[PDB]
């Protein structure tokens, strides 16, 4: 949009998203070419009357997947992995990785695009476990080794957290570093995202916002690949900015490769779990593309939910526009009441 109107346009939508979503608290980050607009509403804990701040800690939940895929893409460029490597290539010594058939193994690309045939979660976990703590890496590989895969890869999409944590395990093995070190070295340290972590301190935990369905703030390395990352609105602003040009900056070198599309909707027999923010017209590496329709532009997006947080990022890279939103839930919170509002805001901004 024209810089003369960016703030006013955001104001046409921000409070509506806040009220319609039934948020306890909300932070909204809008990047439109040279303009950055931040809004925050509500409270960091029900009834505390403290507005969220740029450094309020949040769970980004499944937005984590975009960084897992970023790491994969960066390691691929380094020659450390290939997207087409079978998962088994990065398996512990002597550990079996099940495949549909000998010649059709699960490859890293399948994990990243939800086409691996794996279930959404590892079956048979404990109940009332704090979010993003089970299964551990050791739990996953003990399960995997005796599991059966009964659909061939690259034929059905079915959203999976398990598959994304197995991906993080493989990337860690390929690089010979713990995953947290990769997240630090490839993403957060170079960008100064000093509050973006799987291992929050007490000082950080104190700043975690609270809504309905909250769980204790702790180590979430178990979900390193799928959902565990803590961050802040200001850290996420800096990360999103790398996908978007401004007068003073170009997108990071790997942006286009990170956002490459691998499956058109029609290239798949079926899709499950992919349509939370609207019909998925193509699947990327974590990223999901929705083609222009009705009064909406073509949008690259990712949704997330966990431990009382819901999150959404939507962008139109060719227009240098991106929107990130995080909400702590109340009881009546419906996800698409937040995401539909963001999409409509994006639609107004691209005008």
Domains and CATH numbers, the chain: 1-351 (3.40.710.10)
- In the chain, count of helices (H) and strands (E)? 11, 12
- Taking alpha carbons only, the member of 198, 171, 165 closest to residue 70 is 171
Sign of the alpha-carbon dihedral angle for 182, 186, 189, 194: negative
Furthest C-alpha separation in the chain: 62
Phi, psi (deg, nearest 5) at residue 221: -55, -30
Cβ pair 334, 283 in contact under 8 A? no
Alpha carbon distance 64, 67 (integer Å): 5
Class of residue 6 by CB neighbours under 10 A (exposed 0-12, middle 13-18, buried 19+):
buried
CA angle 232, 234, 235 (to 5 degrees): 65
Q: Which pairs with CB-CB distance under 8 Å and at least 24 residues apart come from 201-209?
A: 204/57, 204/230, 205/57, 207/44, 207/55, 207/56, 207/57, 207/232, 208/56, 208/57, 208/58, 208/59, 209/24, 209/25, 209/44, 209/45, 209/52, 209/56, 209/57, 209/58, 209/309, 209/328
Distance, CA of 125 to chain centre: 23
**Alpha carbon of 122 to those of 125, 150, 163: distances in Å?**
7, 15, 9
CB proximity list for 309: less than 8 A, separation 6 or greater = 58, 59, 60, 61, 209, 211, 326, 327, 328, 329
* Residue 326: strand pairing partners: 27, 311
* Residue 197: strand pairing partners: 230
CB proximity list for 185: less than 8 A, separation 6 or greater = 177
Pairing mode of beta strands 261-264, 282-284? antiparallel
Q: What is the dihedral of CA 160, 163, 169, 173, to 10 degrees?
A: -140
Reading the block at residue 69, the tokens are 């895929």
- Taking alpha carbons only, the member of 127, 128, 145, 129 closest to residue 137 is 145
Alpha carbon distance 339, 62 (integer Å): 14
| Data resolution in angstroms | 1.9
Method: X-ray
- Taking alpha carbons only, the member of 8, 73, 64, 62 closest to residue 37 is 8
CB proximity list for 108: less than 8 A, separation 6 or greater = 72, 81, 82, 83, 84, 85, 87, 167, 170
Cβ pair 25, 211 in contact under 8 A? yes
* Residue 325: strand pairing partners: 28, 312
DSSP class of residue 249 equals B
């Amino acid at each position: 949009s024209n810089a003369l109107l960016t703030s006013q346009i955001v104001d046409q939508y921000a409070e509506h998203i806040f009220y319609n979503s039934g948020a306890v608290g909300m932070a909204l980050v809008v990047i439109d070419n040279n303009q950055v607009v931040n809004r925050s509403f509500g409270e960091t804990q029900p009834g505390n009357n403290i507005r969220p701040r740029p450094d309020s800690l949040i769970r980004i939940a499944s937005i984590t997947k975009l960084m897992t895929s970023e790491i994969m893409v960066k390691l691929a460029d380094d020659g450390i992995v290939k997207l087409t490597d079978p998962l088994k290539k990065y398996a512990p010594k002597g550990v079996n990785v099940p495949s549909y058939s000998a010649k059709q193994p699960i490859r890293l690309l399948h994990l990243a695009s939800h086409t691996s045939g794996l279930p959404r979660e590892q079956p048979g976990g404990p109940q009332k476990r704090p979010v993003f703590t089970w299964p551990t890496k050791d739990n996953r590989w003990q399960w995997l080794k005796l599991a059966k895969v009964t659909v061939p890869p690259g034929v059905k999409a079915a959203y999976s957290n398990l598959a994304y944590d197995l991906l993080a395990d493989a990337l860690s093995r390929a690089a010979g570093k713990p995953y947290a070190h990769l997240l630090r070295d490839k993403i957060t340290a170079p960008l100064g995202m000093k509050n973006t972590t799987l291992t929050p301190t007490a000082e950080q935990c104190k700043r975690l916002m609270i809504g309905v369905g909250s769980s204790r703030c702790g180590n979430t390395v178990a979900a390193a690949g799928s959902g565990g990352i803590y961050s802040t609105p200001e850290d996420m602003q800096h990360w999103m900015q790398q996908f978007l040009a401004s007068d003073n900056s170009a997108p990071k070198r790997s942006a286009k490769r990170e956002q490459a599309l691998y499956f058109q909707r029609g290239d798949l027999v079926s899709l499950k779990g992919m349509d939370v923010a609207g019909q998925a017209d193509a699947l990327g590496l974590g990223w999901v593309y929705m083609a222009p329709k009705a009064d909406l532009p073509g949008i690259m997006q990712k949704t997330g939910g966990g431990g009382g947080f819901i999150t959404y990022m939507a962008m139109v890279p060719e227009k240098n526009i991106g929107v990130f939103v995080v909400v702590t839930r109340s009881q009546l919170t419906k996800f698409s009441n937040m995401s539909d509002g963001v999409n409509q805001l994006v639609a107004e901004l691209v005008k």
